[PDB]
Amino acid sequence: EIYHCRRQIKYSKDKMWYLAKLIRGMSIDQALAQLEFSDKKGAQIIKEVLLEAQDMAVRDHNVEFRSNLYVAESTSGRGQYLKRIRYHGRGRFGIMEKVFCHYFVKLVEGXXXXXXXXXXXXXXXXXXXXXXXX
Amino acid sequence: XXXXXXXXXXXXXXXXXXXXXXXXXXXXXXXXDYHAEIQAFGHRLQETFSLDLLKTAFVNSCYIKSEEAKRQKLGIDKEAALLNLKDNQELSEQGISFSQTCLTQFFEDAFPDLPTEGVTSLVDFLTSEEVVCHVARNLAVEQLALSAEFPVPPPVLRQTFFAVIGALLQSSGPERTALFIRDFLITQMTGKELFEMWTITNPMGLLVEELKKRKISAPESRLTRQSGSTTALPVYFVGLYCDRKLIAEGPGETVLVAEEEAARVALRKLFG
Amino acid sequence: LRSRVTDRYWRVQEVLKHARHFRGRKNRCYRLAVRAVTRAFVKCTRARRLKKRSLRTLWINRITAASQEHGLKYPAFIINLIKCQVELNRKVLADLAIYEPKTFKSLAALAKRRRXXXXXXXX
Amino acid sequence: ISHGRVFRRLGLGPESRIHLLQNLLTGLVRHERIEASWARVDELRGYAEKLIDYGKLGDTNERAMRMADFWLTEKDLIPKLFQVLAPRFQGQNGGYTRMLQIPNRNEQDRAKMAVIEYKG
Amino acid sequence: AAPKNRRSIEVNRCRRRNPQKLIKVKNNIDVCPECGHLKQKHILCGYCXXXXXXXXXXXXXXXXXXXX
RNA sequence: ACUUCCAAUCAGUGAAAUUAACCUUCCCGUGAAGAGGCGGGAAUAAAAAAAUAAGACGAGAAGACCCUAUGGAGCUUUAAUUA
RNA sequence: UUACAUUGUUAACCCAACACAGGAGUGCACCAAGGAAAGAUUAAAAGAAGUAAAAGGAACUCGGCAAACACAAACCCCGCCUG
RNA sequence: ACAUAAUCCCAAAAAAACAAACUCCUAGCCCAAUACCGGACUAAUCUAUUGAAACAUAGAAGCAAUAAUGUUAAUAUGAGUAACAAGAAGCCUUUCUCC
Ligand SMILES: [Zn+2]
């Protein structure tokens, strides 16, 4: 498995998670194209992370075929918070919290296989007949 | 002290993500000796003889091969454990044969009306590896078993169990064995599975064979009534008779399954 | 001078250990865990007290059903069983009302027999 | 309501809008091709065609002259428009002011970019 | 107005995930007919065009500087 | 009816008071006498966004009216007592 | 008596917790000085500022408030008035 | 004859049973509680003794926390909501436009 991580980078975790779930389960190529033409602040960063992950995959692991690489797991954690003073009216100060995001990428070789297909009639006729016999 | 409880909590929490394999030598906390085990073995069970054969019964070829392997590797000294396995295999051989004879006698005396095929099936199921090994593991024979490679695998515990059997055959004679085994096996069965594995192929035809052999009467299936249900399952009432005399009656979801169950009930009915 | 040490943390750890499988902060936070634990124990006691009532009612319903199958109601069957000097519990009576229809049929027959003999002796 | 209405707003006043059109058209006629937002471009098309047609009317004609002087203040654009750019489009009717799309977006507002160009 | 009580995790997740559908993924990817590079659909390439547009801008600046 | 700045959308930076926990419907009654948590009926697959301000005796101020305390302070005198 | 010296200017602006539509002294220009509403879309409700209107012209309302157009005339209370 | 949707708790019906910390049976740690009073014990610190990475014999307390619009710190909710930000073309530096 090929792991890559980026910490102490300042971006919205909730916003980066949008592009993080986007490439999860998807193949390297499709994820690359997506992140390239995806419009957001996380697009560039996650693109860099992916590119570095591919470079590490090729150089360190010495992978024979690049097409056998896909994205198995992607996650976004929260780092330290920078507290800033936001000046408001009537002599009151609010607390502006600048967040941070630690991006983690876990890659596994082999062809990507994901099936979300579920037959309704089969699952119903099986679960009902098994629940009636229990 | 807080250090000992933090260390105990850390060890107890470390054992959750790490599971060590079971070891046979470090299994028992107290020192394991041959005489202690055979002594308790003699105190629990009614009669126990031939301590040498009893110890040999728990000895497996793997432990001997591994021991000799270590002897050759290190090259320190040389000893001969060879006689153990050679003495064990004979006890196992006689054990299997006498077990077959004894169980055959059991099925012959208990169920005289049972056809040869049924006898063969019940014997094959009763002498099956999985069941006997399950009884073994349930009797905690694995604790008394000696295996160098691994304690768990069935080829060890099974051969060990049969060796114990044969040991009881030679030492204690048949009269004691007949008390021991016959008690456990029956208590283990408890199910309908006994006649179910013999019913796995053409239940109807088997009933035809039995009836033609005994009363020489061809079985006839006739639908006596039908209560339908379109939603879940329809219910057909199927009678099964010979010479106008009804042998059995039963409901079914489909005609096939209904005939199968009717043939099964009729199959166990003629068993007596 | 003493210290808080591990005592409070161990008590919280124990309560939260008993707070497992609970929903939300109650399986996380300590206070809500305690509040839920008290209710859990009270409900334990109360439901263990009313369990006999529920089982009794269920058994009475079953026996009532099996009785009505034979043409007589539950109270008449009870009275007949009382005058028959039958101390049999309704649990076993329900078990017979399910698995062994023959025994319940015999008891119902004797019930109708005692009822008819009493109605004929009263007239 | 927006029902049946051309002549968009784009967050600018009438004078600001007209001046914007004059500036974008200035750059367009000057460089022969320009890059701007898709809305401003699509809006600029029609006015560009109009100025071209006004150039096609006549050089001596006063109506076209004062119209051209009204929209374009710059003295450099007019002779290059009439003498050079106009005679090549003489045969064309709707064949000027082509619009194309730009692959990337701005790093700030990510505004969709488009280019307007006359036929060479 | 002010919130009556603190939001639970479940409601937050169900609100921030399902209805927004995250980011819907369509296919914008198409191969450039010229250089064969991967670019956006219904749009000019970002390889064989931006360099030619910069060369055309430098040629227009050089022509405008030579004419003056 | 129109114009512009907001509201609305997208992207960047990312608050606040409030908050016991919340799976949070309605009616008729009851409950310290005004119930989404009680009872009985009616209604209802699961989650948002742009809007309306009836309810959650909404949020915000330990009522500034009333009274209590052998509370405080200002002001005034033929209250009493006097450097 | 060397009174041919010593300091400072010319650096960038600052007071209101803030790179805050609020604040101040002196001389003269109003421009050849200086600042650009320096993220983008949408043309909903609704709000703020602004523009226009058929016919009536205060029928509104506590009051011609507000507001486009204008200020012709009447009569009282109080205070003289400039403050 | 009162003011949101009906029936005085569902539906209906017609004109001797079910059913409680009560009693009995079965076992034993033998028969509730607010204020208040009494008895017997556990967790933690330290000291004397003993034992040495887990304890009991006593003595000595800053000795057991869920609340005080508590204190301090961390982290949420509101919320990706309010709020902050209208010239343009080019080109290496100009032109046009606005106040
Ligand atoms: Zn290309």
Side-chain angles (χ1 to χ4, degrees):
Chain A
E1 295 79 9
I2 302 301
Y3 312 96
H4 189 53
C5 59
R6 292 292 297 182
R7 301 195 306 177
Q8 296 185 0
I9 312 299
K10 175 205 176 183
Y11 288 106
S12 178
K13 179 257 179 60
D14 300 331
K15 293 183 182 179
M16 287 190 60
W17 183 81
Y18 297 156
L19 310 97
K21 188 182 181 181
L22 220 60
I23 67 177
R24 183 177 302 108
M26 298 300 301
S27 61
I28 291 299
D29 179 36
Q30 302 293 337
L32 274 178
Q34 184 67 18
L35 293 169
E36 277 180 358
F37 284 102
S38 180
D39 184 31
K40 245 175 180 300
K41 68 186 180 179
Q44 304 177 0
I45 303 301
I46 302 179
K47 175 182 176 179
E48 294 178 0
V49 178
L50 230 193
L51 182 59
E52 292 293 336
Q54 296 165 28
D55 296 330
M56 291 178 60
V58 174
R59 296 177 182 178
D60 171 85
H61 193 58
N62 198 264
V63 184
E64 304 293 335
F65 302 95
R66 193 177 182 179
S67 65
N68 295 339
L69 185 61
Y70 79 99
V71 178
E73 184 178 353
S74 60
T75 170
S76 303
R78 298 174 300 179
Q80 300 181 358
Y81 301 92
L82 295 181
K83 276 71 181 301
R84 298 302 182 270
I85 304 179
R86 182 175 186 176
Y87 300 93
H88 294 275
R90 300 192 62 86
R92 191 190 69 89
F93 63 100
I95 303 180
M96 171 183 295
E97 299 181 359
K98 293 183 178 180
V99 302
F100 272 85
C101 180
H102 299 352
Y103 203 69
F104 293 85
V105 169
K106 306 181 180 180
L107 256 47
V108 178
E109 60 180 0
Chain B
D33 298 330
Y34 298 90
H35 66 267
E37 305 299 335
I38 65 180
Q39 182 179 1
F41 189 85
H43 286 303
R44 294 177 183 178
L45 296 185
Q46 301 179 0
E47 295 183 0
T48 301
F49 308 95
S50 298
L51 305 181
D52 300 330
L53 301 182
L54 182 59
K55 295 176 185 180
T56 312
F58 296 101
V59 172
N60 296 272
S61 60
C62 302
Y63 183 83
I64 304 180
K65 293 179 181 179
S66 63
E67 181 179 0
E68 296 178 7
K70 295 181 178 181
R71 290 174 180 176
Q72 293 182 1
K73 287 179 181 180
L74 298 181
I76 305 179
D77 294 321
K78 293 181 179 180
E79 300 177 1
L82 305 177
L83 299 180
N84 300 330
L85 178 60
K86 300 180 180 180
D87 293 330
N88 182 268
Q89 294 182 358
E90 303 179 359
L91 299 179
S92 297
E93 184 178 358
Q94 301 181 1
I96 298 179
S97 296
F98 195 91
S99 179
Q100 292 180 358
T101 302
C102 185
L103 293 183
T104 304
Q105 179 182 359
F106 284 160
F107 285 111
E108 181 181 0
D109 297 330
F111 316 105
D113 300 331
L114 179 63
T116 306
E117 301 179 1
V119 175
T120 304
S121 62
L122 290 187
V123 163
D124 290 331
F125 172 74
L126 196 60
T127 56
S128 58
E129 173 180 357
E130 300 180 1
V131 175
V132 174
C133 185
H134 185 53
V135 178
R137 289 186 174 92
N138 288 331
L139 288 182
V141 189
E142 57 180 0
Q143 301 179 0
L144 306 181
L146 300 180
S147 180
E149 36 178 18
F150 224 79
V152 175
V156 178
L157 303 181
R158 180 184 61 90
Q159 181 180 0
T160 298
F161 187 82
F162 291 161
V164 172
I165 295 182
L168 295 179
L169 299 179
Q170 186 69 18
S171 60
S172 60
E175 294 288 340
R176 296 300 178 180
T177 300
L179 301 181
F180 186 83
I181 307 184
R182 184 182 179 181
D183 284 21
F184 292 91
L185 293 185
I186 303 178
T187 314
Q188 292 291 342
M189 289 137 52
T190 326
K192 313 286 186 179
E193 306 175 0
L194 298 169
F195 63 89
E196 109 179 350
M197 295 185 60
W198 189 48
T199 329
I200 62 179
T201 317
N202 59 263
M204 301 181 59
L206 183 60
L207 188 58
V208 176
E209 295 178 359
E210 293 186 1
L211 283 166
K212 185 179 180 180
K213 180 181 179 180
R214 295 183 178 181
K215 202 178 181 179
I216 323 180
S217 300
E220 302 295 334
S221 301
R222 173 187 176 183
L223 185 75
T224 58
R225 196 175 62 260
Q226 47 173 353
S227 300
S229 299
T230 311
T231 304
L233 300 171
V235 176
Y236 289 85
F237 293 94
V238 178
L240 180 57
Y241 65 96
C242 290
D243 301 330
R244 203 58 181 179
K245 304 302 179 180
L246 302 175
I247 298 187
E249 293 178 3
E253 45 267 17
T254 62
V255 183
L256 302 179
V257 178
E259 288 178 359
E260 288 178 0
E261 295 298 349
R264 181 186 64 91
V265 178
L267 182 63
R268 193 183 183 183
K269 185 176 181 179
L270 301 179
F271 169 78
Chain C
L1 178 59
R2 57 99 184 181
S3 299
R4 189 268 309 176
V5 287
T6 61
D7 302 332
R8 183 185 303 179
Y9 199 89
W10 286 354
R11 294 182 178 181
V12 171
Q13 180 66 23
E14 178 183 0
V15 174
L16 290 185
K17 195 268 180 60
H18 295 177
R20 198 182 65 177
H21 103 280
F22 281 66
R23 180 193 176 188
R25 313 177 190 180
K26 298 193 176 188
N27 73 85
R28 299 180 179 181
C29 299
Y30 167 76
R31 311 187 309 177
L32 299 181
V34 175
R35 297 178 182 180
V37 151
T38 301
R39 302 174 186 176
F41 289 163
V42 172
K43 289 171 179 182
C44 276
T45 302
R46 186 170 185 176
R48 278 182 287 99
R49 286 181 179 180
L50 271 64
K51 182 178 181 179
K52 306 178 182 61
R53 304 177 182 178
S54 300
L55 293 173
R56 181 180 179 93
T57 304
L58 187 269
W59 296 338
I60 287 184
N61 295 330
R62 291 182 167 178
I63 299 176
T64 306
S67 301
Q68 286 181 359
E69 293 181 0
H70 292 158
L72 34 67
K73 295 184 179 181
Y74 180 77
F77 190 79
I78 293 300
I79 300 167
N80 293 324
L81 256 59
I82 291 180
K83 300 193 64 178
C84 194
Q85 300 179 0
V86 179
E87 62 178 0
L88 281 173
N89 299 335
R90 40 210 60 189
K91 171 185 175 180
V92 185
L93 186 57
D95 185 20
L96 295 180
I98 299 179
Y99 279 87
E100 309 293 337
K102 48 177 181 180
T103 304
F104 196 89
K105 181 181 180 180
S106 300
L107 295 180
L110 295 180
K112 295 185 299 181
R113 183 178 181 179
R114 292 179 182 270
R115 190 62 179 180
Chain D
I1 204 60
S2 60
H3 299 170
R5 292 184 179 180
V6 76
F7 163 60
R8 313 174 186 178
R9 303 179 185 177
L10 300 180
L12 308 184
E15 298 182 0
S16 300
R17 186 184 300 101
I18 293 179
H19 294 167
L20 177 73
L21 295 177
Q22 292 179 0
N23 297 319
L24 292 179
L25 262 165
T26 291
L28 223 207
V29 68
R30 183 177 180 180
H31 297 71
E32 298 181 0
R33 177 170 60 181
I34 57 171
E35 165 188 2
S37 62
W38 181 85
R40 292 177 184 177
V41 166
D42 181 275
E43 186 65 9
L44 207 276
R45 296 190 305 176
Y47 294 93
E49 181 180 359
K50 288 181 180 180
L51 286 194
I52 292 181
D53 183 34
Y54 295 155
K56 291 188 178 188
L57 296 180
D59 201 333
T60 312
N61 185 24
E62 299 180 1
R63 299 182 174 181
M65 180 178 61
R66 278 97 72 89
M67 191 59 60
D69 296 332
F70 176 80
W71 200 279
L72 299 180
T73 310
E74 185 70 20
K75 303 177 182 179
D76 299 330
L77 309 179
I78 307 178
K80 298 181 180 180
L81 214 167
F82 280 84
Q83 301 179 0
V84 179
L85 300 183
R88 68 179 182 180
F89 287 117
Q90 179 182 0
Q92 301 294 337
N93 300 330
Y96 11 91
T97 321
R98 185 195 294 101
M99 171 182 60
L100 296 179
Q101 296 183 359
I102 282 187
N104 52 25
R105 297 174 176 264
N106 299 331
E107 194 178 0
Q108 304 176 1
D109 48 27
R110 328 157 326 286
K112 184 177 181 180
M113 307 304 298
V115 285
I116 0 180
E117 56 178 1
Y118 304 101
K119 291 193 182 179
Chain E
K4 191 60 180 180
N5 283 272
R6 180 164 177 252
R7 285 288 195 176
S8 60
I9 312 181
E10 178 182 0
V11 176
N12 293 327
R13 292 182 179 180
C14 295
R15 169 171 50 90
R16 294 178 181 180
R17 293 191 177 188
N18 187 27
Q20 194 177 3
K21 304 177 182 179
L22 207 70
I23 302 179
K24 193 168 187 175
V25 179
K26 206 62 179 180
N27 182 26
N28 308 332
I29 310 306
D30 288 82
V31 182
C32 181
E34 303 297 348
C35 55
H37 191 271
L38 304 180
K39 287 300 173 177
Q40 191 175 1
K41 58 183 181 181
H42 299 71
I43 229 163
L44 190 54
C45 178
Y47 196 8
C48 44

